[PDB]
Scaffold this active site. Structure first.
Site, PDB file in Angstrom:
ATOM      1  N   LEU A  44      -8.444   0.736 -16.934  1.00 11.64           N
ATOM      2  CA  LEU A  44      -8.935   2.085 -16.683  1.00 11.64           C
ATOM      3  C   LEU A  44      -7.893   3.000 -16.072  1.00 11.64           C
ATOM      4  O   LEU A  44      -7.921   4.203 -16.326  1.00 11.64           O
ATOM      5  CB  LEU A  44     -10.144   2.049 -15.749  1.00 11.64           C
ATOM      6  CG  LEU A  44     -11.367   1.352 -16.328  1.00 11.64           C
ATOM      7  CD1 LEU A  44     -12.430   1.196 -15.256  1.00 11.64           C
ATOM      8  CD2 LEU A  44     -11.901   2.141 -17.510  1.00 11.64           C
ATOM      9  N   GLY A  45      -6.985   2.468 -15.268  1.00 14.99           N
ATOM     10  CA  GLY A  45      -5.992   3.312 -14.644  1.00 14.99           C
ATOM     11  C   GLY A  45      -5.198   2.535 -13.618  1.00 14.99           C
ATOM     12  O   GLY A  45      -5.228   1.300 -13.577  1.00 14.99           O
ATOM     13  N   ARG A  46      -4.494   3.296 -12.782  1.00 13.96           N
ATOM     14  CA  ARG A  46      -3.561   2.749 -11.814  1.00 13.96           C
ATOM     15  C   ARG A  46      -3.665   3.529 -10.512  1.00 13.96           C
ATOM     16  O   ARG A  46      -4.046   4.702 -10.494  1.00 13.96           O
ATOM     17  CB  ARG A  46      -2.123   2.777 -12.364  1.00 13.96           C
ATOM     18  CG  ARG A  46      -1.899   1.753 -13.477  1.00 13.96           C
ATOM     19  CD  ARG A  46      -0.491   1.780 -14.078  1.00 13.96           C
ATOM     20  NE  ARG A  46      -0.357   2.745 -15.168  1.00 13.96           N
ATOM     21  CZ  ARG A  46       0.761   2.944 -15.863  1.00 13.96           C
ATOM     22  NH1 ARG A  46       1.852   2.242 -15.586  1.00 13.96           N
ATOM     23  NH2 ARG A  46       0.791   3.845 -16.839  1.00 13.96           N
ATOM     24  N   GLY A  47      -3.363   2.843  -9.412  1.00  9.74           N
ATOM     25  CA  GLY A  47      -3.098   3.471  -8.141  1.00  9.74           C
ATOM     26  C   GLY A  47      -1.646   3.269  -7.743  1.00  9.74           C
ATOM     27  O   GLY A  47      -0.847   2.657  -8.452  1.00  9.74           O
ATOM     28  N   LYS A  48      -1.304   3.828  -6.584  1.00 14.03           N
ATOM     29  CA  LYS A  48       0.023   3.576  -6.038  1.00 14.03           C
ATOM     30  C   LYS A  48       0.232   2.082  -5.808  1.00 14.03           C
ATOM     31  O   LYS A  48       1.329   1.554  -6.026  1.00 14.03           O
ATOM     32  CB  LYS A  48       0.212   4.369  -4.741  1.00 14.03           C
ATOM     33  CG  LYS A  48       1.661   4.539  -4.304  1.00 14.03           C
ATOM     34  CD  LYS A  48       1.770   5.463  -3.097  1.00 14.03           C
ATOM     35  CE  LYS A  48       3.221   5.659  -2.672  1.00 14.03           C
ATOM     36  NZ  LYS A  48       3.346   6.541  -1.476  1.00 14.03           N
ATOM     37  N   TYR A  49      -0.826   1.373  -5.415  1.00 12.98           N
ATOM     38  CA  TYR A  49      -0.707  -0.031  -5.052  1.00 12.98           C
ATOM     39  C   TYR A  49      -1.713  -0.883  -5.812  1.00 12.98           C
ATOM     40  O   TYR A  49      -2.138  -1.932  -5.317  1.00 12.98           O
ATOM     41  CB  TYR A  49      -0.895  -0.208  -3.546  1.00 12.98           C
ATOM     42  CG  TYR A  49      -0.052   0.735  -2.715  1.00 12.98           C
ATOM     43  CD1 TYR A  49       1.321   0.552  -2.587  1.00 12.98           C
ATOM     44  CD2 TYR A  49      -0.634   1.818  -2.066  1.00 12.98           C
ATOM     45  CE1 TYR A  49       2.092   1.423  -1.830  1.00 12.98           C
ATOM     46  CE2 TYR A  49       0.126   2.691  -1.308  1.00 12.98           C
ATOM     47  CZ  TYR A  49       1.486   2.491  -1.193  1.00 12.98           C
ATOM     48  OH  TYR A  49       2.235   3.367  -0.436  1.00 12.98           O
ATOM     49  N   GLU A  51      -3.807  -1.746  -9.950  1.00 14.71           N
ATOM     50  CA  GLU A  51      -4.197  -1.491 -11.330  1.00 14.71           C
ATOM     51  C   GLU A  51      -5.700  -1.701 -11.420  1.00 14.71           C
ATOM     52  O   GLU A  51      -6.248  -2.578 -10.747  1.00 14.71           O
ATOM     53  CB  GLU A  51      -3.443  -2.399 -12.302  1.00 14.71           C
ATOM     54  CG  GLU A  51      -1.923  -2.378 -12.061  1.00 14.71           C
ATOM     55  CD  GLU A  51      -1.117  -2.586 -13.324  1.00 14.71           C
ATOM     56  OE1 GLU A  51      -1.634  -3.231 -14.260  1.00 14.71           O
ATOM     57  OE2 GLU A  51       0.034  -2.105 -13.377  1.00 14.71           O
ATOM     58  N   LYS A  67     -10.246  -3.640  -8.983  1.00 21.89           N
ATOM     59  CA  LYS A  67      -8.998  -3.052  -8.505  1.00 21.89           C
ATOM     60  C   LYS A  67      -8.099  -4.199  -8.072  1.00 21.89           C
ATOM     61  O   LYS A  67      -8.358  -4.839  -7.046  1.00 21.89           O
ATOM     62  CB  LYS A  67      -9.279  -2.090  -7.354  1.00 21.89           C
ATOM     63  CG  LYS A  67      -8.061  -1.498  -6.646  1.00 21.89           C
ATOM     64  CD  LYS A  67      -8.575  -0.720  -5.391  1.00 21.89           C
ATOM     65  CE  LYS A  67      -7.450  -0.120  -4.578  1.00 21.89           C
ATOM     66  NZ  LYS A  67      -7.968   0.829  -3.547  1.00 21.89           N
ATOM     67  N   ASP A 155      -7.096  10.770   2.308  1.00 18.09           N
ATOM     68  CA  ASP A 155      -6.540  10.922   0.960  1.00 18.09           C
ATOM     69  C   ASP A 155      -7.558  11.617   0.070  1.00 18.09           C
ATOM     70  O   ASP A 155      -7.762  11.238  -1.090  1.00 18.09           O
ATOM     71  CB  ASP A 155      -6.120   9.565   0.376  1.00 18.09           C
ATOM     72  CG  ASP A 155      -5.139   9.677  -0.798  1.00 18.09           C
ATOM     73  OD1 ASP A 155      -4.466  10.717  -0.960  1.00 18.09           O
ATOM     74  OD2 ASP A 155      -5.037   8.695  -1.563  1.00 18.09           O
TER      75      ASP A 155
HETATM   76  C1  FXB Z   1     -12.838   6.388 -15.234  1.00 19.70           C
HETATM   77  C2  FXB Z   1     -12.694   5.392 -14.367  1.00 19.70           C
HETATM   78  C3  FXB Z   1     -13.579   5.149 -13.157  1.00 19.70           C
HETATM   79  O1  FXB Z   1     -12.855   4.608 -12.030  1.00 19.70           O
HETATM   80  C4  FXB Z   1     -13.451   3.940 -10.972  1.00 19.70           C
HETATM   81  C5  FXB Z   1     -14.829   3.611 -11.014  1.00 19.70           C
HETATM   82  C6  FXB Z   1     -15.442   2.932  -9.958  1.00 19.70           C
HETATM   83  C7  FXB Z   1     -14.689   2.556  -8.817  1.00 19.70           C
HETATM   84  C8  FXB Z   1     -13.327   2.886  -8.780  1.00 19.70           C
HETATM   85  C9  FXB Z   1     -12.678   3.580  -9.852  1.00 19.70           C
HETATM   86  C10 FXB Z   1     -11.241   3.731  -9.430  1.00 19.70           C
HETATM   87  C11 FXB Z   1     -10.988   3.171  -8.164  1.00 19.70           C
HETATM   88  C12 FXB Z   1      -9.613   3.355  -7.840  1.00 19.70           C
HETATM   89  C13 FXB Z   1      -9.024   4.052  -8.926  1.00 19.70           C
HETATM   90  N1  FXB Z   1     -10.037   4.275  -9.896  1.00 19.70           N
HETATM   91  C14 FXB Z   1      -9.880   4.987 -11.230  1.00 19.70           C
HETATM   92  C15 FXB Z   1      -9.669   6.500 -11.009  1.00 19.70           C
HETATM   93  C16 FXB Z   1      -8.750   4.391 -12.091  1.00 19.70           C
HETATM   94  C17 FXB Z   1      -7.538   4.464  -8.960  1.00 19.70           C
HETATM   95  C18 FXB Z   1      -6.630   3.761  -7.898  1.00 19.70           C
HETATM   96  C19 FXB Z   1      -7.315   3.509  -6.552  1.00 19.70           C
HETATM   97  C20 FXB Z   1      -8.772   3.016  -6.657  1.00 19.70           C
HETATM   98  O2  FXB Z   1      -9.200   2.399  -5.708  1.00 19.70           O
HETATM   99  C21 FXB Z   1     -12.287   2.615  -7.678  1.00 19.70           C
HETATM  100  O3  FXB Z   1     -12.501   2.087  -6.651  1.00 19.70           O
END
Ligand code: FXB
Ligand code: CL
EC number: 2.7.11.1
Length: 332
Positions: A44-49, A51, A67, A155
């Site tokens: 779904l995506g990435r954070g600084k620390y 995936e 996460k 943040d």
């Molecule tokens: C379209 C995707 C939905 O995205 C969710 C859904 C439920 C819970 C979380 C996320 C999520 C978290 C975290 C991050 N996303 C995403 C933005 C990629 C990015 C990095 C930091 C992070 O903790 C959730 O906890």
């Protein structure tokens, strides 16, 4: 003499009145689940620390979000987990469902309730005036809750606000930078994303508090009602304060610095210059005027103050006239 000390205006001593274990996250023992309960579906995506993946809990066929952490200090992992557990069940706070140890990365993976997000670079262009007031009110519920629970998020930004617009459901996510507020504690100022950093971070004033989140919230609100993302568009942390000063003016900035006896990094002397405080009408035009009202501008002005002690609290913010229609609708 050094900087003048500061204390939160609200929720000042809530952690002191808690048992030590509530905030002493270095002594927290992590409760692990079974990594085999979960099969990853897609990224779904990435954070600084981290995936982030969509996954299936195969014991109950529930969709979850996983996460997977990159190498972080264990005490910072304990901090995020402890804060997530302390805040679990609070309004619009993401629900931590499980914690497992990933066999490949050998790192922890946090398992969250699933939220069907609409990317804000697509969503925010479609929101109405009422939608902005509604979702701002929902964010405020989450912030008043975590502040009342002795926690600052540090943040707040659109990327950390998940919105299932079809179901009008919002969750505040990514508690990896959040910290417990203790009166007199000096905090790391290297937090938050550039465009949302409060002036206290930019001038290196370490004794900050919940009001940091309220600056960030104001930055988000400005970007939404003016359709200008980011609102304060700095090239670096120094220029970030210049961009703020070109709007809020340099006079109130230097008064702020004088009030708290802050020693200003000498690099700032040659770049801050002198700037008047601008009127918000300067950002209003035909493409955003339907989102801007006297109430919105009054509310925004009361969030975006240099002096963190003068910003609205989350609870004060929720009582502002900007939200009267939202508050009345939620009563029925
Ligand atoms: C379209 C995707 C939905 O995205 C969710 C859904 C439920 C819970 C979380 C996320 C999520 C978290 C975290 C991050 N996303 C995403 C933005 C990629 C990015 C990095 C930091 C992070 O903790 C959730 O906890
Ligand atoms: Cl848990």
């Amino acid at each position: 003499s050094g900087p003048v000390p500061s204390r939160a205006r609200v929720y000042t001593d809530v952690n002191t009145h808690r048992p030590r274990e509530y905030w002493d996250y270095e002594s927290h023992v992590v409760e692990w689940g079974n990594q085999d309960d979960y099969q990853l579906v897609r990224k779904l995506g990435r954070g600084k620390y981290s995936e982030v993946f969509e996954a299936i809990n195969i014991t109950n066929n529930e969709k979850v979000v996983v996460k997977i952490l990159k190498p972080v200090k264990k005490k910072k992992i304990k901090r995020e987990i402890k804060i997530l557990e302390n805040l679990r069940g609070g309004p619009n706070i993401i629900t931590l469902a499980d914690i497992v140890k990933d066999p490949v990365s050998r790192t922890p993976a946090l398992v969250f309730e699933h939220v069907n997000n609409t990317d804000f670079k697509q969503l925010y262009q479609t929101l109405t005036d009422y939608d902005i007031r509604f979702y701002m009110y929902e964010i405020l519920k989450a912030l008043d809750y975590c502040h009342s629970m002795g926690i600052m998020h540090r943040d707040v930004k659109p990327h950390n606000v998940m919105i299932d617009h079809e179901h009008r459901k919002l969750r505040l996510i990514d508690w990896g930078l959040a910290e417990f507020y203790h009166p007199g504690q000096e905090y790391n100022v290297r937090v938050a994303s550039r465009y949302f950093k409060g002036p206290e971070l930019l001038v290196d004033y370490q004794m900050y508090d919940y009001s940091l989140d309220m600056w960030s919230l104001g930055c988000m609100l400005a970007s939404m009602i003016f359709r200008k993302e980011p609102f304060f568009h700095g090239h670096d942390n120094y220029d970030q304060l210049v961009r703020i000063a070109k709007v809020l003016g340099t006079e109130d900035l230097y008064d702020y610095i004088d009030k708290y006896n802050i020693e200003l990094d000498p690099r700032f002397n040659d770049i801050l210059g002198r700037h008047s405080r601008k009127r918000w009408e300067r950002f209003v035009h035909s493409e955003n005027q339907h989102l801007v009202s006297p109430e919105a501008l009054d509310f925004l002005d009361k969030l975006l103050r240099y002096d963190h002690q003068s910003r609205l609290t989350a609870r004060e913010a929720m009582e502002h006239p900007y939200f009267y229609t939202v508050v009345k609708d939620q009563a029925r």
